[PDB]
Every structure is written in structure tokens, then in C-alpha cells.
Amino acid sequence: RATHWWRAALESFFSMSLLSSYELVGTKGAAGVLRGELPGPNSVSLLSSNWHDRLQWSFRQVVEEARRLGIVAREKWADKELLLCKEIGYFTAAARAAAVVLSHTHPAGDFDAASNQEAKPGVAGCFVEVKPDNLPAVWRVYRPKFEDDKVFVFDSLVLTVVHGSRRHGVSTRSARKVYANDYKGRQAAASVIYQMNLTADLFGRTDYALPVCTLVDYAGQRIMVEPLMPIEPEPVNVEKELVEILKKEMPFYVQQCKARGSEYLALDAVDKVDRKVDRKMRFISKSLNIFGCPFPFGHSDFDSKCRIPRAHLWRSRVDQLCVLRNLQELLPPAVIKGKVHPTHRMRERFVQQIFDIPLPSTAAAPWTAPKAENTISKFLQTTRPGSGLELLEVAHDALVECVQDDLVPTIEALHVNFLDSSDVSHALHEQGVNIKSLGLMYNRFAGAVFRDASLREMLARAAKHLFLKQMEVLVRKKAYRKVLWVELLQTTIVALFNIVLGTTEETRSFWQEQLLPEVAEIFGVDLVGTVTPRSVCHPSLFKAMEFHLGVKFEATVFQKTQTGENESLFLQLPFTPADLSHFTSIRDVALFPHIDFIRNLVTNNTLRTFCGFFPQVKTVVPASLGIIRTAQEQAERFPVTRDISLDVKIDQMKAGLTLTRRLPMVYGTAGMASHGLNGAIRASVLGVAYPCHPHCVMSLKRSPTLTTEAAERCLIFEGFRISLALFLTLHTMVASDIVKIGKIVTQLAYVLLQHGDTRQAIAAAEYIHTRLPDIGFLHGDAKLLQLQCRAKTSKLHSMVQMYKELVPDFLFFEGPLSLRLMLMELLIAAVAFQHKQYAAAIPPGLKVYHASALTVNPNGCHWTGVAALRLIGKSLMELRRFSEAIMVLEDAVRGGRKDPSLPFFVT
Amino acid sequence: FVHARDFELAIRHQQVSQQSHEGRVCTELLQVVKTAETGNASHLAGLQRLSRGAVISTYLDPLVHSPIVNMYAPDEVLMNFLLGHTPETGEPSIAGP
């Protein structure tokens, strides 16, 4: 069938069978062994009730077998890794199932309301809320971080709704961030724990389960869904237990550490009780690159009067494993001048892959490292730090320098993306910079498309934060008991979208006093008085606001006003609740999975009640698995471009800027201009080779014998294809992704298109723009495959059909100055040059030249500008317009002369 | 108050279409073809009927559009006066007292 190796993954994404705790469908993993052993409906289930049992059993299977070696034994290690992620995807299917119906039946936690107004009946009844009088065992191990938070136990899933804290001063916005980096701590731990069990090297006291949690977001509630650990034998705090034995072995050493900062600082001496525990914690501290105790037990960064539960590692008796809880302080914080920001956290990629110097835990954690770190990469940036605050100041200045000189020029020289809402929020996150540092990138960006992409991203975020401030008010007053909650949720969407983008006065006044000040107090750039709405009024802002708010609209938003062989798309600007999306068509069913199942349980036995929101799901798949790391480290040792030579690296330092570091990166090395058909024009201009930049590798050793006797595709091609293929299958069986699933397929099809293979890139493209939703520019990229695929295998007529569709698509969704438009026009001019039309290559190639000076590098030229002016000069040469050819080529000489980022071959 | 959108429409300057009578009836009636093909009843009261006040005959017999046919229905009385003038209704108004 050929297409099967990618089609079977995406079909499995479309069928992720919704399972209760007792249901075990399958014959492969946990469903083939644990089936029919721990049964029972929701009434009898509550405690234990699989989930944690199923997930930790699969985690026990992957660690047992990777210990075994052999080619047949490691084939079966490959299956259990996908079976583990399929089991995690079973948890996420019930995570979206429980939380979505939680918002409908119990709006904002408390039942009451104008919905289900009539023992609580319906599916609402199966939800059992826990106060510290109802189930005190649940309240101990799972205590809400703030006081307004409610905790619901359903099946075996703890659902902590986020509502802030009134008394203490914690807004619902800030509470969502402290729950966010609590998740980021558990994702940080999940990779390290998997690796620690994976390697051989280092009734075992601490056993370190896989930390699993999902942050599902349906209409700004931030439901945190976690598995229930077994609580019938109430779990022993391993923190208390370890230091109680230590207090009975070295009583005085514990007390001396207590006067230092806390009794948990003595836990660096846990070898006295157990050799196994101390060396296991040494591995966690080394991998996450943190001083001392890897998890922040004794010390915190939030003030003590705000009662926030510190790190706990509760171990039970039924399965004898300790699970990590409340890791909101695991990552090192960012400090700006001495004022500590405990809501903001540095990323995983910066801590463990950029700043190799270890970083402290909170701030008040005392700094303890005896001058052994004299000089390494980044060499502490001098100034000799003396305490934990100064080292975090060194770390934050390193992150400012990394976002300044290592992320801006990489994006500026194409490379990543930074084009359409998501993958702008991914390019920041995976390069190692938090998304809140985007204001610094706006000031340093020179090109117009990157400046408008960052401006659109900040404004789309800011309208989301006004949306969260408004629902802070709507929960502040008790209005969800007066009015019906579903249409109050919907009427906030239509009121917000009309007030931010419109053609009236009240949208210009709303920008001047509320939206632009919101950008200033978060991203830290004063944009009041410059970002008047007639600069980014294009519906690209509507698309970025669509994704970041979790609300979907219908395709009836985008009509068209054709006037003869065009489309001329527009959007109407009355927004109504009717224009909100009803999940019925094949294109938007794969954005709220199980629409037909969530329909039947909150209606009748309990159309304008589901419309709009979809859950944004942020699962915790460990980034240390075999499939994850294989595709990643192949993508770093085989980069797209390492430039023609090394003397041009020295030239870019001469009268220029610093050097760019790009990190390993699996998906998102996509678009044109890197390895599309414009990568061939880029390679001819820059002086390099387009497929697999330094060579065309077909063997494994340089063989003179073979070349003397000589006087099915690239090994990089087959390797990165076959690694990204199983990378796609893993994430689809995870499900719960939507947008980044499409980002895997469009990256995969760009690589298939690179090394010939036109038919597979055609089929992978047509799946994207018929079945996947419209939440990014994923449908813009999907047709963007087709124009490149036809271009390779002639097909000039399907080129013209495909071109007249995406010209009005790109003038409308990106404005009249677009990166996708300018690269598309250069490809049309290149095809016109190949087939020797000669004329009708000047009109498209001129639009490349009038755009490339402004859209990228206004400080002078680009490879797109040089390729444009060379195409115009060649065409006017062979059409005997010799005088005009003198201007075009000499203008390329003058502009490209005194400009870096272009090698000597260009000038 | 029912046609509250068109009342605040008459405070605007509007845009004059640079086309003939045939050019006029070509472009909104090409518009309504595929706005009908996209479906939904939300467009039905908005543009699917309101754009149908555009006849493709310059001649109109006076026994219709008479000064006494503005008796059977007062909706087009308000539409021909409030800057519709023979050639979007989605903004609701909160009906409080």
C-alpha cells in the first residue's frame, strides 16, 4: 500500500477507544495480562482502581526488558515502548473525558448553578468531591495548592480544578502558572527517572514511579488530572521516614542542619541509612543539573504565610513505589536584579543543555559548592558568584544573552520556523527560552515577517490574559448560579473577539488602554502608541487568538469575493455565538475527540451547549525514551546546513555579530527555504549542495577501489525517515496533541519531498488538508506541499491551479508582505527559468525583490534577494534587454558587498 | 430597536461601489451563491434575504413599488429610508429596561 507506514499512525489517532478504569480493551500490553482482575463500576471503584496500576505496570515492562540485550530482545523493547505510550494515551482519553463533563455538570467546581438545577443526580453524581472531612486519606496525599481549588475523585483520577486563592492574594492567572511549572517539574522528573531505571550502572526503599499528570484546559479552568496512587495502606512520607532514621543515627548532625536552613538539608547524608537511596538521588541531581537534594523538600521560594504544599515523594505499600508530587520548585527560578520571580521558571533545555554549571533550587536554598567550577563553557560570566541569588543572576543573564545572540539570528536565517502561532510557542520552548521573554526578541528583530510574527504572538497571548481576568470576575461574583454557564462562556468569546478585531472606534479604544498595557506588563516592552490596530488587523491574529484561547470557529468565517479568476478571501465582522464551531464535520471532529460520547452523557440522562471550546491537552510523555532520543540525536549529527566553509564563520565575526547555536531539534525544522525546492536555489546561490548538505552519502566507507572500477537513496534520508516514522506513530498513539501531530506529518513530508519521493509526499499532504483541523497555518502548509511536489515531476497545469488558490490565501492570512508568498514567487520564477519561458519570470521574480528587502534582513540583502536579482538579470540577458540587465546585476553587486551573513561566493 | 444595527449604520459614510447596475447585481449575487453553499441558518436572516432587495430590471412597473404598497409590510419602508436605498445584522443589543 506504500502509504501504510504513516497512515496507520494517523488512523490510530482517530480511534483512541475511551476506557473506564475497569475496561481493558486490547491483547497487547496491560489489557492482555491485567484484564478482568480488578473490576467494578464507579460506585465500588474509587480507591486504587487501575490507571496508576496499568501505567506503572507498563513502566515496569519497559525497564525489565531493556536490561535484556539481543536483536530479538530489543525488537520487543520497541513494542513495549509504544505500548507504554498507548497506555499513557488511555489515561489522557479519560482525562479529557472526566474534565470536560466536569465543567458542564459542576461549573467552577460547585454544583449548584442554573445547569442541573432540578443526592446529586446524573453523571454529576459519580463525581465525589473531597474536603478534609469527607475522605481525609485523599486530602493528605492530594491537597490543593491553594484554598479555592476543589478536588474531585472519579474512577481513579484526581481532578484539581484551578481557581486561585482569594484571601492570600493569588489570582487565577498566577495559580495557573504555579500549576504549570508543577507539571513542568514532573515532566522534568519523568525523563530522568526513565533514564535512571534504563541504565544498568547504579524492597529498594525509593523506587521512583513514572510521574504522570495532564493539564487539560476547557474554557480557562486548568483541570489537573493525575492517577490515584493506592491509598488503603496510607502512604508513608519517605521524606519524614528518611530523616527520622537519620535523627536516630546522627541526631546532632540533623540538628546542625536544622539551624542552617532546615532539617531536610541533612538528607545529603542518606548513605548512612541506605547506599541505594543516596546514589539514586545523585543521578537525578546530575541529570537535571541541580545542587544537593534534587527535589526542593526543606526550602521553598514562595513566602511561608501562603501555605503551599512543598515537594513530597509519598510511597505506598500495595505496589511499594514512591511517586513524585508538588514539584513546582524543581526548576531553578529566574531572578532579574535581585527580586525573585517564583512564578517564572527556566526551561529544561537551558538548565541541562545550555548552562552546564549546576543551578540552585529556589533562592533561600544555601549555595554549597567549594570553588570546583573554575572555568567551563560560559565560564560563569566572571564576577565570582557567592550565594544562590548571584548564581541565578548569572543564569538569567546567560538566558538573556542566549535569547539575544543565539535565538534571534537563527530564526532570522530561516532555519526553524517562527511563522504561525504554534511553532512560535514551540521554537521558544525547545531552544531553552521561556515564552515570556518574547518582548526582548521584538526589539532585536529586524525583518518584517519576524517582527510581525512576534507582535501577533504577544497580542494573541494578551487577549487570552484579558479573557482569564474576565473569568476571574465571573467567578468572583456568583453569576454562574444566576445565569446559564454555557452561554455565559460563549458570550464572553464573541464579546472579546469583536472588541479586539473590528472596524469601529471601540476596538481602537480597547487596544489603547487595555490590550497594549497587558503586553507591556508581561512581555516587558512599552508598545503603547505604536501598535495601532491597522498594522496587524489581518486574520492571522484571529488564527493565533483561536489556538491560544482554546475556542474553534467554523469555516463560514472565511468567505471570498472573487471578481474573475481569484478568490479574495475575507472574514465577516459580526461575531455571533452561531459562528462558533459545532463539532460535526470531518475536519473538526479531530479537535474534540469523542464528541459523540461526551454528547450522550451530559445531555438527556442528566445543540447549543457544546459549541466553541476544545480542551488544550499538555501530557507528560517522557523525553528520554528510545524512540524520542534516537530521532533527536540523529537530527543533531546530521543538520540541514553547516555552511560552505569555516573561513566564512570567521568573516561573520569580522565586522559583525556572534555565532549561533541551534541545539538538537526533531520536528519544526520545516517550511520552505531549508530543504524544499527553494533549498536548491539557496544551495546554488550560497555555493553548497542541497540534498544532505556536505555530500550525497550512499555507502559507509571511502573506497578508492570502488571509484576506480566505476570510472537506494541517502543513508541520512532513510535513517531520518525511519526514525521520524516511528516518532509519528508514538505521538499518535499518545493522541491528545492535535496541532503538533500535524507538525510531525508536515515535517515528515518535507523530508520525503527532499529526496525525491513525490508520491508519498503527495499522499501525506492530502491527509493534512482534508481531515486535520484549521487551527494553525496547517492547511496553508499542506497545500504548500502540493505546489512543491508537482514542481519536481513537471505538472505545470496543477502548478497554476495550486498557485491561484494560495495567492489570495497568503495575501489574506499573512498580509501583503509575506515570507511564504516571497518564497512561492521565487519558486514560480525558478520553474519558469527551468522550462525556458524566459519572459513571465521577470514579473514573479520582481515581486521577490520588492519583498525580500523588507521581510527579511532590512540591514541589507538576503539569499532570496540575490537569487531574485540573479533570475531577473539572467532573464533580461537572454531576452536581449541588455541595458536593463546591467542595472539588475549591478544592483545585486552594490547591495551584497558590505553585508554579512552572505558568504564570499555570493559577492 | 429591532433594526438597531441599521440605525447606527446611517451615521457612517459607506463606500460607493465602482460598477454598473449589471456589475452590482453580478457581485453580491455571486456572493450569495457560495454563502448559501456553505450552509447554516445564521446567514439566512443576515445576508441570504437582505441582499435579495436587488432587482435586475431597471424598469419597474408602478403598480408595484407604488406609494401605497408601503402598507402591506413596513420592513422595506424602514429599509428604503435608513440609507439602504435598495442596496451584517449579527450585532445583538442587550434587551434590558
Binding site: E506, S509 | E8, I11, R12
Partner: peptide, 12 residues
Amino acid sequence: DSALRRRDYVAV
């Protein structure tokens, strides 16, 4: 009518 914006902002 954008002055009716500003005057109504003064009023309720």
C-alpha cells in the same frame, strides 16, 4: 460618532 464614544465614556 467617535465623539459620542468619548462623551458616553464620561457618562454612565
